[PDB]
């Protein structure tokens, strides 16, 4: 039987502070015992001073990074390069994933 | 599927289909609405050039669409019965999903939306109907009137007749019917729409059907011996 | 949920209903009423899973009230449980079946007779003088099949009905916190508040 | 009267005057040609400089079917990319079943029923464009013409546009002095030469020369377009011929 | 594309007259004569085979046709409507009927469901009426012989015996003369043969005219043995030899 | 006066976009002929190749349907090959579904049922073409069966189609008047194909080269066309005699 | 005249009216200029307001970070068009991680045209458009008319009273196709190109919208006192 | 006849030309927009005096920062309010704020030229829409069927739209208060009203940042109109 | 392309009438006459076929009268193929109600049921309306014994007595004249056929140009009997009211 999901590995973390933000991770790549990658970028610049994580399944996790950095082009065209607030990015991601509620993205997202 | 714009604009701004459905209403025997302190009559002429009928069974004029809301019309009959049909759907439907009866604005607002639909939808005609509806919120002894017509434009009324010879009972009720002082019984009520439809309608015997609607759902309709008694009390006044 | 009474005597149809709803660990309600009214002379009570009876017996009340409204008319006793059996069939052949059993309880005032039906979920419909759902029948028909008489009055057929309530209460490992019971006759529909 | 408003409407001649109105527009387009030569075709075609302005060899005007069909199309520019866009369906969809690529017979019925289906029916319009079309397949080379009305055969050599009567008569000259055959560097000269000789019903604007070809010899039977040393060579072979 | 001609193209005209439909039965008046003739122990129906030219082969062109085993058609008007008729009466006597109750149509409902189609073409979309009037003849357990015309505009009525097409004004007159409720099947192939002589101008032989008849049950032509309650098909087409040899007793 | 433009009835009776269609037929300009022999069925049909600059080898109004069927075709190019692309289609689909090849006056039949479609149906023009399919078939031996844009089909002995058709079908009859039988009495197929072509000439009071006829023969189990020198052959032995 | 009441129909001498008065709505709109040099591509655009106390049309919609457009014509239209256009390069970004060609851009905005002049029930689109960009083989400019015809130039115009501004592009053409590396300049002389085709009023603060694009510029809309410095 | 989607040979669309006629017989309405909020007036126009007025609703709430008043045929901005209404509460249910004023005005013209043979005509009614937003401030736009919105700092719509844009011309400036925009709606639809002016037949709205959009009491306008009268007494 | 040919069949006229309702109403006065009369102890249907023929075979024909079910007929004036149509669907509705109830259909219930379907070619689909008018002769038990009428606008209304098809103006004042409340059906039996006899179009009134019906309680005890008159029964009743 065919199995749509897997397990990339890989730790992120993120913490905030007075006037700044940090989003870490890991570079290594794995699958089961073995490593795909050593350097393989997990954390990335989405634009509007927003950096974003999904760790899990990469695939997925590509798959939504993507699809966000996506919804931040077409919120510019759409409202006059109006600059994305966290809190609208964070609602925002919210529907990305619910609208895969029954078949959903394997990844623990950070922004 | 037939996509036809039947409705459309003119080089002087006028939809013909929806004026030319208004016209349907002026043909339709007249109706109409008057609202006291304390209930709402809604009277309809009957032709008489129809004898021979079964009043039992013949579709009345005046239609209830919940248990404490009326609607009746002018204009082509067997519209009307679509736009009841879907207003009494939609009565259901709102008690089933807010827990509340309809509002008598709410169920106009749905009806002269539908209306107003068949004003720009394709392969349609509009509504030959302009309609009445009157009744009480549920918990409210306020009296509605509200008032429907082919382009989908509603309003509220004090009083309001439609259908022909409409121009002349209105200004009957503009001139008898004092907002600072509305009919403040049953009686008065109903015999100010008596006397709005005796300008126009020919004899009083079979012609002139009422109905009152009281607050709580109390809607009745009066019989032929009750208006006679009303029609012969108006003209004894009158010779004087 | 759970139980689910009712019957016919000489001039009115008596439906007893239980007041607990049990969500797994706690009973969250005992003052629970598992009915709706179809008619002012047609009473319907409802047992199954949780969230489609009430589902089910809001909708056949809003077609009934809609037949009501359009034809100025209500409708036999009769003509109501053929309405509501079909539309149990239609649903057990359905993506999800409505996993309901109901008794429609109703006074005919043309023919001036109380009438019961008892309808399961499968759409299987029988015209009794007492009826059950559940496990209920199994602690109560040997009582009713003793007792029972046509020419029952009212007060005769309450006190039958607390006689099986009583053993129900006795026999059941369930606690369904006693029963709301309602009458139906030719004056309409009437609940008894102290039982 | 009133036949002529509609199209698929026979005419009591029996005549379909929506499609005759398309010619029109074929017939008010740029002067296009096709040759058929030994082991191969050649395509040019002629493209009006209607101001200083437009970007030398930029507006390409030739289109590639697959890689071995070339297509090109005198009239309304758009209808001829439409069309160039359902036969580069027809023949994916051709491809993707039976492996071989289209032959020219095959793909030229292809263009030919869904031109003709658009003389069916009053709620389309005829294509205004003749399309020159053709290539090399496993039985030599092809070369087609094909008109709003949706009918086609096969050519020696071909022309439309505004031109096409001096083009045909050059064409024609070719057919007779060479019984034999031409070859495909010599087609391509003879082609740009053919496109100068037809500019003379152009004469006001000038022009830039635009030629193709797909041969077995020259290109490895794939569609090509004639670029730098080899043009230049036959625009000077052109300008010696009209002086 | 898409048929974007979703309106009607039958419409009252002021005066109340359905245009196209009169204008269908004009087409089946200018038809060739067609007629049948209801006896007590069958039902006659025939026309004459008007050949376009004489290398046609017009044995290929059936003009009375086998809708059922037990009843045929023929017709007056537009020969292609007919034969799509044909093709549509024969396969809704299946699927409307036999693939139900496992049995064949009585007459009467197989012209209910053939003027139904014809109706049809009458007020749906982007279509004109069938430019045929059709005769059915049957037979039936329950309902005995009876023959049906059918119009252009789906309406149908039961006849003793009628005409249609070309000659029908003059052919109803001398069938009004000679039928009477006594008659035998060979009695009415014979009034059939007068009546339609009349009609035709040129030749008049066995292979001219087009003749099939409704009758006895015929074992011969079923195909196979062994089933008592199957007796064969009571719509048989006669030879142009058979048609010949009651000529030389007309 | 839109009962002219789409297939609706006019106060006559009559379907006007059929007649008309019955006129682009001719507009080829281009006549054929159609008999049976014993063994074979032969069509033939005038070639005119107007412009030097065509490749006279892709110039045909000539189709082979299936493996037995041909069909020739009388009108414009477009229709004829959208006639013949159909008329292929469900000649193959037939022997998917039924497990046996489709015979000729079947699928004569079932091109006229989409005709008469086009002729009560408005939104479909008819075909501007007449179809005339020929085989041997297996069951009915020689067949020619003619279709036109009335929906209207029949089986022939022999049968002419175009401008010139009256001219070609009185000389047939007579020839058929004279031998009282309804096909050409003869073996070979070559010598069918002989009549055809001599008969025609007769009748067209024109004589032909190789370029100027385009022949089919069907054959029990296969239909063919011939090549110019086959043709060739055909009328050198008419001459020799 | 009988032959313009639809799409569908060509008149007798092979015409299709309905695309010609599509192409008439262009001409009464406002003019737009497009030029560029090898390094640089730019828009110009005269803004249209329809009183003293309305503000002016926008005229530049931005498609991509390397491609954009200005308008003439039915604005409604050049946004269904500009919408269009946002998403093609949006696909070629996340199918092909490839910037869209504005050649390919050009040969999609023609196919889309085209399916509105031979249909029945539609109309055809009424705005003209001006696509510059920066891809792989440089600056490029294009114009479209929604006949479906799309020409790759050095400069145009289009709009009312764009002739003026297009005899002045087809003068200076030798100089300003070599103002490579100084954007000032390039954009200098599309404002002195767009100068000749007014007339009554002159560019103001308000009036005024320019656009770039070039090798190392993100297509950018300037607006408001950023086009001061050059009125 | 001819085609709903057509064009004119002067290039502009027969049906969304003929709908700009039917705005022009509907009732008046007046937008004036300021640095302290943007005023809305209509002019109710009750074709009888039994109709009762507070019933005409020409003026209406997109949002808690969007109001909307219209002119023409107005049973057909009913679905344009359903879409405008539907369109600000999605927006902030997809991210948790508020719509621009300018895009949610977008999205209404986005339907205008949606019919053909979608809806089988244009619209017959046009649309003041303001509103505020904290990039773009206080603003006023006009929205027509033809699918063209443009903001303006005051505009009539309606009968009386060019005797009333004039008089807007001469009268707006960039330091206006709110209560000098009140008295300057009142006073002009005063101006082009057939009827004489009170609190029953025009009706007055605003949008502020603090209180969001408000419909004004007919006592509350009362105030206004004999605070206009005395003004006007004055000299 | 297609609008070009487009009728329009569903707009109003610039006085408010639905054109092609008003002409589908001028081809149903062509039509054969039919009458309906209702009594205290039932309802009587009779109508006039339209210029029959000698050969036409009566006994099996029917073009007026039809059976919708066990409680309810109708007589037909219009289109035949339009109204077996109508018909059809009827039958259908009928049943689709004695499923769902277990009860049978309320005569009005069905009478709106087709109505609406006549209206809903009145205001969309760009369909010709049904060219049929239907007499309803029914009883439930609910109003007893119920005479309806319905035409090609889908509007419908009750009556004591009515006519529809050809020479209504004149049979409806005929009808308005001898008819009272306290009539029974053997009068009105008599009345109906008096009034077509007077309003025919044809020089006599025989049975072969008749189709008769009557819905009586007279069913042995509680229940209604429908009866649809043969030929010969047609002759007799002729012969009993002193007409032939
Ligand atoms: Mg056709």
């Not at chain 5, 002021?14 to 067609?34: C, E, M």
């Not at chain 6, 989409?114 to 031996?141: C, H, K, N």
């Not at chain 7, 200076?172 to 007339?199: H, M, W």
């Not at chain 8, 773009?136 to 309606?158: C, M, V």
């Amino acid at each position: 039987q065919f199995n749509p999901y897997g397990d990339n590995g890989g730790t992120i973390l993120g913490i905030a502070g007075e006037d700044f933000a940090v989003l870490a991770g890991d570079t290594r790549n794995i699958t089961d015992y073995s490593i795909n990658s050593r350097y393989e970028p997990k954390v990335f610049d989405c634009g509007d001073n927003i950096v974003m994580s999904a760790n899990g399944f990469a695939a997925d996790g590509d798959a939504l990074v993507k699809r966000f950095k996506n919804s931040v082009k077409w919120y510019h065209f759409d409202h006059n390069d109006k600059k994305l607030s966290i809190n609208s990015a964070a609602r925002n991601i919210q529907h990305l994933l619910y609208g895969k509620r029954f078949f959903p993205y394997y990844v623990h997202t950070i922004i | 599927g037939y996509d036809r714009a039947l409705s459309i604009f003119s080089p002087d701004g006028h939809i013909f289909q929806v004026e030319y459905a208004l016209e349907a209403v002026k043909r339709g025997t007249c109706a109409v609405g008057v609202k006291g302190k304390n209930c709402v009559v809604l009277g309809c002429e009957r032709r008489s050039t129809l004898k021979l009928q079964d009043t039992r069974i013949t579709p009345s004029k005046v239609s209830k669409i919940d248990s404490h809301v009326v609607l009746s019309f002018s204009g082509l009959n067997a519209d009307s019965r679509i736009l009841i049909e879907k207003a009494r759907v939609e009565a259901q439907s709102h008690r089933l999903t807010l827990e509340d009866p309809v509002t008598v604005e709410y169920l106009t607002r749905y009806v002269a939306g539908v209306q107003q639909r068949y004003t720009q939808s394709g392969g349609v005609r509009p509504f030959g109907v302009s309609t009445l509806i009157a009744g009480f919120d549920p918990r409210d002894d306020e009296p509605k009137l509200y008032q429907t017509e082919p382009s989908g434009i509603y309003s509220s009324w004090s009083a309001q007749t439609i259908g022909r010879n409409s121009k002349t009972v209105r200004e009957f009720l503009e001139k008898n019917y004092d907002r600072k002082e509305p009919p403040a019984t049953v009686e008065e009520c109903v015999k100010l729409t008596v006397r709005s439809l005796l300008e126009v309608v020919q004899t009083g015997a079979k012609n002139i059907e009422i109905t009152v609607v009281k607050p709580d759902s109390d809607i009745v309709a009066l019989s032929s011996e009750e208006i006679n008694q009303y029609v012969t009390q108006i003209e004894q006044e009158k010779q004087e | 949920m759970d139980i689910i009474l009712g019957i016919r005597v000489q001039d009115s149809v008596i439906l007893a209903s239980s007041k607990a709803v049990t969500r797994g660990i706690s009973v969250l309600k005992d003052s629970d009423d598992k009915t709706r009214q179809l008619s002012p002379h047609t009473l319907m009570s409802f047992a199954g899973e949780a969230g489609d009876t009430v589902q089910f017996a809001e909708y056949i009340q809003a077609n009934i009230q809609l037949y009501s409204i359009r034809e100025d008319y209500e409708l036999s006793p009769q003509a109501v449980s053929s309405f509501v059996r079909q539309e149990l069939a239609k649903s057990i052949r359905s993506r999800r079946p409505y996993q309901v059993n109901v008794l429609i309880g109703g006074y005919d005032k043309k023919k001036n007779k109380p009438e019961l039906y008892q309808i399961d979920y499968l759409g299987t419909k029988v015209e009794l003088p007492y009826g059950a759902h559940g496990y209920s029948g199994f602690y109560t028909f040997s009582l009713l099949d003793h007792h029972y008489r046509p020419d029952m009055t009212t007060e005769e057929g309450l006190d039958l009905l607390k006689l099986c309530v009583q053993e129900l209460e006795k026999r059941m490992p369930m606690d369904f916190k006693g029963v709301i019971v309602k009458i139906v006759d030719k004056d309409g529909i009437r609940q008894v508040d102290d039982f | 009267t009133g036949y002529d408003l509609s199209n698929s409407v026979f005419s009591p001649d029996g005549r379909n005057f929506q499609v005759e109105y398309a010619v029109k527009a074929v017939e008010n387009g740029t002067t296009s040609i096709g040759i058929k030569c030994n082991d191969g075709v050649v395509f040019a075609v002629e493209k009006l400089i209607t101001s200083k302005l437009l970007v030398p060899q930029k507006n390409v005007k030739i289109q590639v079917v697959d890689r071995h069909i070339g297509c090109v199309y005198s009239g309304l520019i758009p209808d001829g990319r439409h069309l160039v866009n359902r036969g580069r369906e027809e023949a994916a969809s051709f491809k993707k079943l039976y492996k071989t690529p289209i032959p020219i017979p095959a793909f030229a019925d292809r263009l030919g029923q869904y031109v003709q289906a658009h003389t069916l029916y009053n709620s389309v319009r005829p294509f205004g464009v003749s399309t020159i079309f053709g290539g090399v397949d496993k039985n030599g080379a092809h070369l087609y013409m094909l008109e709003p009305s949706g009918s086609y055969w096969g050519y020696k050599g071909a022309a439309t546009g505004k031109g096409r009567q001096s083009a045909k008569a050059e064409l024609e000259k070719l057919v007779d002095h060479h019984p034999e055959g031409l070859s495909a560097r010599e087609a391509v000269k003879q082609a740009a030469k053919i496109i100068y000789l037809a500019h003379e019903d152009n004469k006001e604007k000038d022009f830039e020369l635009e030629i193709s070809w797909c041969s077995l010899s020259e290109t490895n039977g794939l569609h090509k377009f004639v670029k730098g040393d080899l043009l230049q060579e036959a625009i000077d072979f052109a300008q010696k011929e009209i002086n | 594309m898409t048929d974007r001609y979703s309106f009607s193209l039958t419409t009252f005209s002021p005066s109340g007259k359905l245009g196209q439909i009169d204008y269908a039965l004009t087409a089946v008046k200018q038809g060739v004569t067609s007629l049948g003739i209801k006896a007590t122990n069958g039902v006659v129906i025939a026309t004459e085979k008007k050949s376009s030219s004489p290398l046609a082969m017009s044995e290929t062109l059936s003009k009375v046709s086998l809708l059922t085993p037990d009843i045929g058609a023929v017709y007056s008007g537009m020969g292609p409507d007919y034969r799509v008729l044909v093709d549509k009466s024969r396969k809704v006597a299946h699927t409307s009927y036999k693939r139900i109750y496992g049995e064949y149509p009585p007459t009467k409902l197989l012209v209910s469901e053939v003027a139904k189609i014809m109706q049809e073409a009458t007020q749906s979309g982007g279509v004109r009426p069938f430019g045929v009037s059709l005769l059915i003849a049957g037979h039936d357990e329950f309902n005995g012989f009876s023959l049906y015309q059918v119009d252009p505009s789906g309406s149908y009525f039961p006849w003793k015996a009628t005409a249609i097409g070309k000659g029908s004004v003059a052919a109803k007159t001398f069938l009004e003369k000679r039928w009477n409720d006594e008659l035998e099947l060979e009695d009415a192939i014979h009034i059939a043969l007068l009546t339609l002589k009349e009609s035709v101008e040129g030749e008049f032989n066995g292979d001219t005219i087009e003749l099939a008849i409704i009758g006895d049950e015929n074992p011969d032509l079923l195909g196979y043995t062994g089933i008592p309650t199957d007796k064969g098909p009571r719509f048989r087409k006669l030879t142009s030899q058979e048609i010949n040899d009651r000529l030389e007793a007309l | 006066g839109y009962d002219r433009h789409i297939t609706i009835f006019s106060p006559e009776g009559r379907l006007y976009q059929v007649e008309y269609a019955f006129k682009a037929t001719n507009q080829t300009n281009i006549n054929s002929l159609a008999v049976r022999g014993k063994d074979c069925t032969v069509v033939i049909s005038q070639k005119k190749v107007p412009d030097k600059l065509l490749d006279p080898t892709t110039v045909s109004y000539i189709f082979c349907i299936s493996r037995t069927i041909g069909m020739v075709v009388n009108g414009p190019i477009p229709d004829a090959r959208n006639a013949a692309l159909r008329a292929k289609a469900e000649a193959a689909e037939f022997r998917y579904k039924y497990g046996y090849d489709m015979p000729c006056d079947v699928l004569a039949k079932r091109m006229a049922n989409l005709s008469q479609i086009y002729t009560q149906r408005a939104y479909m023009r008819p075909l501007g073409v007449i179809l005339t399919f020929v085989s041997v078939d297996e069951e009915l031996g020689p067949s020619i069966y003619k279709t036109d844009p009335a929906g209207y089909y029949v089986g022939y002995k022999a049968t002419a189609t175009g401008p010139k058709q009256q001219e070609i079908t009185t000389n047939l009859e007579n020839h058929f008047k004279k031998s009282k039988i309804d096909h050409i009495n003869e073996e070979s197929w070559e010598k069918v194909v002989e009549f055809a072509i001599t008969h025609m000439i007769d009748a067209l009071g024109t004589e032909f080269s190789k370029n100027d006829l385009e022949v089919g023969v069907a054959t029990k189990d296969k239909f063919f066309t011939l090549s110019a020198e086959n043709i060739e052959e055909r009328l050198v032995a008419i001459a020799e005699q | 005249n009988n032959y313009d009441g639809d799409t569908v129909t060509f008149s007798p001498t092979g015409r299709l009216f309905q695309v010609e008065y599509a192409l008439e709505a262009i001409k009464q709109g406002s003019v737009t200029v497009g030029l560029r040099s090898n390094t640089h591509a730019v828009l110009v655009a005269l803004k249209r307001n329809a009183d003293e106390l309305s503000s002016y049309q926008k005229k530049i919609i931005k498609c991509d970070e390397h491609m954009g457009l200005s308008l003439a014509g039915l604005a409604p239209d050049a946004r269904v068009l500009s919408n269009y256009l946002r998403q093609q390069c949006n696909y070629s970004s996340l199918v092909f991680n490839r910037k869209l060609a504005v050649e390919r851009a050009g040969h999609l905005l023609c196919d889309k045209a085209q399916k509105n002049t031979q249909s029945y029930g539609g109309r055809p689109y009424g705005v003209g458009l001006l696509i510059i960009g920066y891809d792989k083989s440089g600056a490029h400019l294009l114009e479209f008319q929604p006949s479906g015809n799309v020409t790759e130039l050095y400069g145009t115009a289009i709009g009312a009273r764009s002739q003026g501004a297009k005899t002045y592009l087809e003068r200076t053409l030798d100089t300003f196709i070599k103002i490579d590396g100084n954007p000032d300049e390039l954009i200098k002389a599309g404002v002195e190109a767009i100068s000749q085709s007014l007339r009554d009023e002159s560019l103001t603060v308000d009036n005024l919208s320019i656009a770039i694009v070039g090798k190392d510029t993100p297509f950018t809309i300037y607006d408001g006192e950023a086009v001061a410095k050059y009125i | 006849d001819r085609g709903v989607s057509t064009f004119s040979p002067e290039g502009r669309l027969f049906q969304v030309e003929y709908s700009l006629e039917a705005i022009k017989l509907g009732s008046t309405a007046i937008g004036i927009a300021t640095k302290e909020g943007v005023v809305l007036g209509v002019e109710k126009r009750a074709t009888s005096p039994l109709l009762e007025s507070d019933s005409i609703e020409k003026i209406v709430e997109i949002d808690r920062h969007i109001g909307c008043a219209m002119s023409g045929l107005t049973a057909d901005a009913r679905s344009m309010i359903e879409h405008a209404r539907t369109a600000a509460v999605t927006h902030n249910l997809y991210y948790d704020e508020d719509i621009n004023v300018e895009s949610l005005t977008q999205s209404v013209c986005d339907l205008a030229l949606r019919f053909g043979e979608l809806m089988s005509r244009p619209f017959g009614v046009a649309l003041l829409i303001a509103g505020h937003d904290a990039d773009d401030g206080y603003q006023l736009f006009h929205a027509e069927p033809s699918g063209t919105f443009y903001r303006y700092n005051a505009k009539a719509i309606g009968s009386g739209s060019e005797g009333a844009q004039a008089e807007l011309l001469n009268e707006w400036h960039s330091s206006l208060t709110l209560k000098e925009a009140e008295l300057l709606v009142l006073k002009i639809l005063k101006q082009v009203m057939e009827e004489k002016l009170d609190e029953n037949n025009a009706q007055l709205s605003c949008i502020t940042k603090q209180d969001g959009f408000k419909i004004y009491d007919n006592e509350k306008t009362a105030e206004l109109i004999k605070e206009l009268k005395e003004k006007e007494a004055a000299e | 392309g297609s609008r070009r040919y487009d009728s329009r069949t569903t707009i109003f006229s610039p006085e408010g009438r639905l054109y092609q309702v008003e002409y589908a109403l001028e081809s149903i006065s062509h039509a054969g006459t039919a009458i309906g009369i209702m009594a205290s102890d039932g309802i009587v249907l009779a109508a006039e076929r339209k210029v029959t023929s000698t050969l036409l075979e009566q006994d099996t024909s029917t073009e007026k009268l039809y059976k919708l079910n066990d409680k309810i007929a109708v007589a037909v004036a219009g289109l035949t193929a339009d109204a077996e149509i109508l018909i059809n669907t009827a039958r259908i509705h009928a049943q689709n109600y004695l499923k769902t109830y277990n009860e049978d259909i309320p005569v009005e219930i069905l009478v709106r049921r087709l109505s609406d379907i006549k209206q809903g070619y009145t205001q969309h689909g760009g369909l010709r309306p049904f060219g049929v008018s239907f007499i309803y002769a029914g009883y439930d038990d609910r109003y007893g014994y119920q005479l309806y009428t319905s035409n090609p606008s889908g509007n419908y209304t009750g009556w004591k007595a009515i006519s529809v098809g050809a020479n209504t103006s004149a049979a409806q004042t005929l009808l308005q004249m001898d008819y009272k409340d306290d009539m029974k059906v053997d009068d009105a039996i008599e009345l109906a056929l008096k009034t077509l006899s007077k309003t025919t179009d044809s020089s006599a009134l025989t049975y072969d140009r008749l189709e008769f019906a009557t819905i009586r309680k007279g069913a042995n005890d509680g229940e209604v009997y429908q009866k649809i008159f043969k030929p010969q029964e047609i002759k007799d009743i002729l012969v009993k009211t002193g007409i032939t």
